[PDB]
Structure formats: C-alpha cells, structure tokens
C-alpha cells in the first residue's frame, strides 16, 4: 500500500541474506529466482527454502517446483493472442463484436442515481484485441473500481454456485469508453477466450503447441492442476492451501481461481520458474521461437494513446499506484506495452529504457530488459497471512540484486 521504490531494499539488500532472514522469521518458506541474458552466458538460478506437501512432509525447494503464476499468466496469454495475429486469425485493431459479442454488448457505467440504479452510455467504438492486452478496454477488476464493485453487489450474484467461464464471470459494465482510459482488469481473460474461439480449441491446447512445445516445456497446466505428476511438485498444494488455489501468492482478500471453469488467461497458469524464464528469454533474444521479430518488437512500444496514457499515469499516482508501478520510481516515465508495464526513460544501473515488467499476486515479479540484455523472474513462496509490504521489499531485493549480480559477473570475464 506504499511505494517501496527506493530504500534499503533498493540500495543494500542482498537476496541470499534477505530471503534467508525472511525464512527464519517464518514470513516466507522459500523462493525461486531465474535470470538470464539472451545467450545464456550470464545465468542465475536459485531455489531457496522449503516446501510442504499435503501430507505434511517437508522438502527442499527446487528449481523445477511447479509454481502458481497468477497474473504472470497475462504475459503468456498476450503471446498466444499475438500468435493469432501472426496467423491472421485476428488483428490488434479489428472489431471483436463478431467473435466476442459479450464485450460489444457492454455499456459504460457513468454513475448512479439516488434511487441507486446505473446510468450508462453506449460504447463510442468497438473493443479491440489491443485494448484487451493494454487494460484500456474499460473492463476492470471490481476491487479496483468501486463503481463496478457497487454495481456487482447490487446485481447480486444469485449464489448459484456453479463454476463459471470467463464470459459467465466478468459480466460488469465498462469503467470508461474503450480506448480512452486505463484500468487493470480481466482484459486478458477475455483475450484468452477470443483465442479459444477463433482457434476452436482450448487455451491450453493452443499454448501447448505454440509456446510450450517449441521451448521444450512439458510441465504446465491451468487451474485446476489435475495432472498427478504436476501435483506432486505443486508448491501451493499444502496444509495451508489444501485446494491449491494460490492463496499465498494472491495473499489475503480471496482467490482468482476459486469458482471458475475453463482456462483463465488472466491468472490461471502453473509453471516452473525454469520454464517461465525460457519464455522471458525467447523474447529477450527475439529468436523467432514464438513470434517473428517485428511482432516481438511491437510489444515494447507504448500502446496507450494520449487519452489512455493520462488515465494510466493518473492511476499510477492514485492510492493504488504502488500496485501498478511494479517497483518503478514514481518519477520514472512509463507506458503500457503488449505484455506489462513499459519503462519509457532509462534508469542508471537498473532497468533500461523499454523494459517490460509485471508480476503475479503480491509475490511474483518478472522483467525483460532488452537494452541491458537481461531478463528474470522472482517468485516468493509466502506463508499465510501474506505480509504485503514485506513482499514488496523482497521483490525489490530481487529486482535490484539481480542487476548487482549481473554487474559483478560482467566485471569477471
């Protein structure tokens, strides 16, 4: 709830020392860190701490433990969407009304009566794939726009507790006119549905052939993880999370996963840290394993138009700015690319200009720094209750100490 952009995590903290202290404090159980340059010259992979099985037996944390990505799924969904643009099944600016009529049918909630009933406005334009990937569609998580939260409570969910698909779950109005604003929301759950529809298969099938197979990734699954071989390595299948919901990653407040069915491109993927960094690296290298190099290039551009960008930058200064800033400085010029936050200026001895970065829940964070030839992912395996402020510091420790280790390694050849 506070900006942890600069302080002792930024300037002093070392992962080895800080994580280990967090373990013995009993506030985390371990961590998985994976970083690499484009060629695999510099490579840092460290699993620290312990995991607990459902039986209660303990094991040392390990680099191939299966982790809950939570919102780090959004990057992988973004790729699958861009892979459909390559094939010409979609386009970034086309009208999606045909494929996803539910989004065309959405009105823009403008406010409420004193009768407490919604005032709406029809969409000035169709909602596009690009607006889905840049959180400028107008679709917001209800916990980030009170209006949508109010509307969602009034039109109470009848408690017909049946697992719902993406379209059956994010039924709310838009928070602003398509293209004209920015707010974090289910834009990539919608995108993953669009992928399923235009391709005529499940999201997991598509991702498995177009992302995981090219990279040699076999140990992936969306929630719920039914493969017994993966469940044996699931970090979050343990006595504190006997349902493997990802409670420790999302922290308090509830779970993205609980009452859905089908894949959720916004938050649903499980994956090892080792396999996730392969994806980060294929994009750092721009090696044409997932996309053609121009398409990857297009991911590292500011994609919010003037109206959206001001809304983004206003949101970054809102009381929820800390969440949206991913550790960057409140004075660092940023935009939004296809896949995460985009640094627009350079930061000396940290993120290069046009670094893409996002995270998962409160405990996972990733970056791609093409200018400085570094990418990485750090995933804290917390213990409940998850301490949000401490997690920000632990993530900061990763985000800077990995650059520190990079500089040291470069001064050694």
From Swiss-Prot:
InterPro entries: Beta-lactam-related, Beta-lactam/transpept-like, Diverse_Enzym_Activities. Gene3D superfamilies: DD-peptidase/beta-lactamase superfamily. Changing residue 184 to A/E/F/H: Abolishes the catalytic activity. The keyword Hydrolase applies. Keywords: Hydrolase. Esterase that can hydrolyze the side chain of lovastatin to produce monacolin J. Is also able to hydrolyze the side chains of mevastatin and pravastatin, but not simvastatin. This is Lovastatin esterase.
């Amino acid at each position: 709830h506070h900006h942890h952009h600069h302080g002792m995590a930024s300037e002093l903290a070392l992962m080895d020392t800080t994580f280990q202290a967090a373990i013995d404090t009993g506030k985390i159980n371990g961590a998985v860190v994976c970083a690499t340059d484009a060629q695999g010259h510099f490579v840092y992979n460290k699993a620290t701490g312990e995991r607990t099985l459902l039986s209660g037996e303990k094991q040392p944390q390990q680099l191939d433990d299966v982790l809950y990505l939570a919102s780090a799924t959004k990057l992988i969904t973004t790729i699958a969407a861009l892979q459909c643009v390559e094939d010409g099944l979609l386009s970034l600016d086309g009208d999606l009304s045909s494929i996803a009529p539910e989004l065309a049918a959405k009105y823009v909630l403008t406010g409420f009566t004193d009768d407490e009933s919604p005032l709406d406005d029809p969409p000035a334009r169709p909602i596009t794939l690009k607006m889905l990937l840049t959180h400028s569609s107008g679709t917001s998580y209800h916990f980030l726009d009170p209006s949508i939260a109010k509307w969602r409570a009034q039109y109470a969910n009848p408690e017909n507790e049946k697992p719902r698909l993406v379209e059956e779950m994010f039924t709310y109005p838009l928070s602003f006119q398509p293209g004209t604003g920015w707010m974090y929301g289910p834009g990539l759950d919608w995108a993953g549905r669009v992928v399923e529809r235009v391709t005529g298969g499940t999201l997991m099938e598509f991702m498995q052939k177009r992302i995981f197979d090219p990279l040699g990734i076999t140990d992936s699954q969306f929630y719920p993880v039914t493969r017994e071989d993966l469940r044996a390595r699931l970090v979050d299948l343990n006595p504190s999370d006997p349902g493997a919901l990802g409670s420790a990653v999302i922290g308090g407040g509830g779970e993205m996963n609980l009452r859905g069915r089908g894949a959720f491109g916004g938050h649903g993927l499980f994956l090892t840290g080792l396999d996730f960094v392969k994806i980060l690296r294929s994009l750092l290298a721009n090696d044409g394993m997932l996309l053609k190099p121009a398409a990857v290039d297009n991911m590292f551009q500011q994609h919010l138009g003037p109206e959206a960008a001001a809304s983004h930058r206003a949101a970054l200064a809102s009381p929820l700015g800390p969440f949206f800033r991913v550790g960057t400085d409140p004075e660092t010029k940023v935009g939004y690319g296809l896949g995460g936050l985009l640094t627009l200026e350079d930061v000396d001895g940290w993120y290069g200009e046009r670094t893409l970065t996002w995270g998962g829940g409160l405990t996972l964070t990733w970056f791609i720094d093409r200018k400085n030839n570094l990418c990485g992912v750090g995933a804290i395996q917390a213990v409940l209750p998850v301490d949000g402020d401490l997690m920000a510091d632990l993530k900061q420790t990763f985000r800077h100490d990995i650059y520190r280790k990079y500089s040291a390694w470069k001064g050694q050849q």
